[PDB]
Write an enzyme that holds these catalytic residues in place. Structure first.
Site, mmCIF file in Angstrom:
data_model
loop_
_atom_site.group_PDB
_atom_site.id
_atom_site.type_symbol
_atom_site.label_atom_id
_atom_site.label_comp_id
_atom_site.label_asym_id
_atom_site.label_seq_id
_atom_site.Cartn_x
_atom_site.Cartn_y
_atom_site.Cartn_z
ATOM 1 N N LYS A 63 0.965 -1.292 -0.052
ATOM 2 C CA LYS A 63 -0.093 -0.105 -0.018
ATOM 3 C C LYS A 63 0.772 1.208 0.070
ATOM 4 C CE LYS A 63 -3.680 -2.756 2.222
ATOM 5 N NZ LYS A 63 -4.647 -2.194 0.898
ATOM 6 N N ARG A 137 -11.001 20.514 21.599
ATOM 7 C CA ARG A 137 -9.846 20.325 22.900
ATOM 8 C C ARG A 137 -9.829 21.716 23.478
ATOM 9 N NH1 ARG A 137 -7.189 15.700 22.573
ATOM 10 N NH2 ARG A 137 -5.480 16.346 23.941
ATOM 11 N N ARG A 170 -1.375 15.806 32.180
ATOM 12 C CA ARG A 170 -0.040 15.276 32.781
ATOM 13 C C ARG A 170 0.960 15.063 31.914
ATOM 14 N NH1 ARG A 170 1.558 10.322 35.678
ATOM 15 N NH2 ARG A 170 3.356 11.014 37.235
ATOM 16 N N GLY A 177 -8.454 17.021 25.630
ATOM 17 C CA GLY A 177 -9.876 16.549 25.184
ATOM 18 C C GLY A 177 -10.774 16.473 26.394
ATOM 19 N N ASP A 178 -10.274 16.533 27.431
ATOM 20 C CA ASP A 178 -11.027 16.340 28.794
ATOM 21 C C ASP A 178 -10.351 16.550 29.821
ATOM 22 O OD1 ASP A 178 -9.829 13.879 29.294
ATOM 23 O OD2 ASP A 178 -11.683 12.529 28.661
ATOM 24 N N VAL A 179 -10.724 16.378 31.125
ATOM 25 C CA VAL A 179 -10.000 16.655 32.265
ATOM 26 C C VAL A 179 -10.041 15.172 32.970
ATOM 27 C CG1 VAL A 179 -9.202 17.760 34.301
ATOM 28 C CG2 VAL A 179 -10.300 18.944 32.247
ATOM 29 N N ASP A 180 -8.994 14.664 33.286
ATOM 30 C CA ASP A 180 -8.763 13.437 34.163
ATOM 31 C C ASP A 180 -8.333 13.623 35.626
ATOM 32 O OD1 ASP A 180 -9.428 11.662 31.793
ATOM 33 O OD2 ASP A 180 -7.376 12.420 31.016
HETATM 34 NA NA NA Z 1 -7.875 12.957 28.737
#
Ligand code: NA
Ligand code: NA
EC number: 2.7.7.7
Length: 326
Positions: A63, A137, A170, A177-180
DNA sequence: GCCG
DNA sequence: CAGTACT
DNA sequence: CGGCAGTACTG
């Protein structure tokens, strides 16, 4: 790098196509090949040279040189016309391949079709309501403000509670994208019953706007996945993911929640080759598995007070969070 | 898809 | 349970 | 041939 942008871009299209159609292992293979190409020191120029790279076999090499010699991949022209719609549907939080394919077969082609005609789970309705926001984001500075909001609420009723933002944050990414948020207590017993107090405190100040996953009638709740919004103008809805863990599980939970996802999978794969097992709860040794690689016997938990211990016990050099993208 |  | 989700 | 990570909710 990336010295193969022309090549990977085309492969990524094919990769997402397989993923959204549910072919998760073929899609996994493409993903690893694509990363290996993004990581290569030079433009790949030969068939032989393509095969030399780990994650790239004879089939993916074909490919690559087809793209190299023709500037096109014929496979791309024969992708089902459903794939764009499937990807649109699958980007609804709570809907995956199975639901996207059902909605498509039922005749739906747009989010408008979904909104007006489709059967939506409680989660999927929330995902739809925040469709654009869940694809954006946030700047990492905003993640800091969200982490601080959760930390202040937690520490307000127990000052000993440790809170730390994990995931992309971290790992030092500019945007998230989010908060963990990982939460634990260094004494070893206090973390019991804190979700109820924390979630009610965050609701009372109007910070949480929607809940996606939150089992709070049980008591052994491990995670909260939901939606928040900081106060004031110009604010968007942000995905907030919180986990509360026993202190003895802190390092493994930190490692897991920091990721990346591929990094975790890779680390857990290595652990299995050594007859060990790694999860968000613990690193275990002497794990008994059958010939199909399935755990049939428990093993023993290994003391892992820090992330460095987990690496150490796996015979691995330590890797700082920013170095864990892959 | 890759690879042991 | 299957589906979807977390990293 | 067959595994490709190991978990936690939802309904
Ligand atoms: Na995240
Ligand atoms: Na989705």
């Amino acid at each position: 790098t990336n010295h193969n942008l022309h090549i990977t871009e085309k492969l990524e299209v094919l990769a997402k196509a397989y993923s959204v159609q549910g072919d998760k292992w073929r899609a996994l293979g493409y993903a690893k090949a694509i990363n290996a190409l993004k990581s290569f020191h030079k433009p790949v120029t030969s068939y032989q040279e393509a095969c030399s790279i780990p994650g790239i076999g004879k089939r993916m090499a074909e490919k690559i040189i087809e793209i190299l010699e023709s500037g096109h991949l014929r496979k791309l022209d024969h992708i089902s016309e459903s794939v764009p719609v499937l990807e649109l549907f699958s980007n609804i939080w709570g809907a995956g391949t199975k639901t996207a394919q059902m909605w498509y077969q039922q005749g739906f082609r747009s989010l408008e079709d979904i909104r007006s005609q489709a059967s939506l789970t409680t989660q999927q309705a929330i995902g739809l309501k925040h469709y654009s926001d869940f694809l954006e984001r946030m700047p990492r500075e905003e993640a800091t403000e969200i982490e601080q909001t959760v930390q202040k609420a937690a520490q307000a009723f127990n000052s000993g509670l440790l809170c730390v933002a994990c995931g992309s944050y971290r790992r030092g990414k500019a945007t998230c994208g989010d908060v963990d948020v990982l939460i634990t207590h260094p004494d070893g017993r206090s973390h019991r019953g804190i979700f109820s107090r924390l979630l009610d405190s965050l609701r009372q100040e109007g910070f949480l706007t929607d809940d996606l996953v939150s089992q709070e009638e049980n008591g052994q709740q491990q995670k909260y996945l939901g939606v928040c919004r900081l106060p004031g103008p110009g604010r968007r809805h942000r995905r907030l993911d919180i986990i509360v863990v026993p202190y003895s599980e802190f390092a493994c939970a930190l490692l897991y929640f920091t990721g990346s996802a591929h990094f975790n999978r890779s680390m857990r794969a290595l652990a299995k080759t050594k007859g060990m097992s790694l999860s968000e709860h613990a690193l275990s040794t002497a794990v008994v598995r059958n010939t199909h690689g399935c755990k049939v016997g428990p093993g023993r938990v290994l003391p892992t007070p820090t992330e460095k211990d987990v690496f150490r016990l796996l015979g691995l050099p330590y890797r700082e969070p920013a170095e864990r993208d892959w």
